[PDB]
Amino acid sequence: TRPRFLWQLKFECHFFNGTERVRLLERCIYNQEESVRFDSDVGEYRAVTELGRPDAEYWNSQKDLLEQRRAAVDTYCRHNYGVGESFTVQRRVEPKVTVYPSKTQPLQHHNLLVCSVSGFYPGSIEVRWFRNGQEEKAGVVSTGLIQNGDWTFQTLVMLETVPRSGEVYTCQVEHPSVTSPLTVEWRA
Amino acid sequence: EEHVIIQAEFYLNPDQSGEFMFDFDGDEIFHVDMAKKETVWRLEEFGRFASFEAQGALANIAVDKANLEIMTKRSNYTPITNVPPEVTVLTNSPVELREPNVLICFIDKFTPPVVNVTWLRNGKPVTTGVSETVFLPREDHLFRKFHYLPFLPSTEDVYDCRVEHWGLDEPLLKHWEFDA
């Protein structure tokens, strides 16, 4: 199978504070090397590598091509942002929280208690563990956020314990999709 | 910042294959089917609130085919360097025996955007309700992609996501199997 050649083009809009402050950044990427780009805060093209020189100088000439690009920030960015805001920016699916120990073993034996939170969107959430109402900050091993690729996230937050009877463990989840924190206890 | 919306499109030769899509914070919003010439929303629900003219994309790609033939020659025909994938089989939600779930095959950090993913249940290929996503982009100019297999957990089975890529010495198997 012959050699491969890849041309890639990306216009990315980064929104800060909601809509006040947007940055358009147009990148042309040949193979894995970016060659030229348009950065809204610099108003014009700039070759990043030598092969992007011709174009950075070419397009930079067309005072019309540069006239629009600079306005793409509201004609394209702020636009597309207000088009999907209802379903993207304001998407909220609710987290589904579960508490279960891995490795059923006897009490007083080290056990890793797992808090699986899955199905949520947006990715911003907060998971805390409590042992007998007092927050347990240590021995908390997390998988970090995991993006399912279907517009929902998931993450696993484990607490290392040595359960004595009656100790009650709680998992508290805070997510924009909910008013008051989801909690879920586990009895020794 | 807070959110990023990206229109990523590419054209690849010899394959003569391209893609055009929009991405919001890492997830795909939609992408234009080059063949049927129609925009395909990622979650049907999206199509009920917004629209995009699939021809817009076919136009754009036309130029990309072009700029590519251009750029190749000026590079002096330098080809791409294969970066093999970073596969990891995951599960949609905590598996309970006999209760439907979905197995996710996550393929990351690879380039060129060409890869063969097979699902195997007990050593044998499976197409039952399997599906995938187009090549999602990444800041490092490599790609990302997902394959999903809806399944029903039981202690009897074991699976594999079988990934083939040019920067790989041989077909990568990533294994999964319920545990008690």
Binding site: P54, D55 | F22, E53, A57, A66, N67
Partner: peptide, 13 residues
């Protein structure tokens, strides 16, 4: 609403 795409500029020859 309509998603507004951005067009690709042809390279320098």
């Amino acid at each position: 609403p309509k998603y507004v795409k951005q067009n690709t500029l042809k390279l320098a020859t």
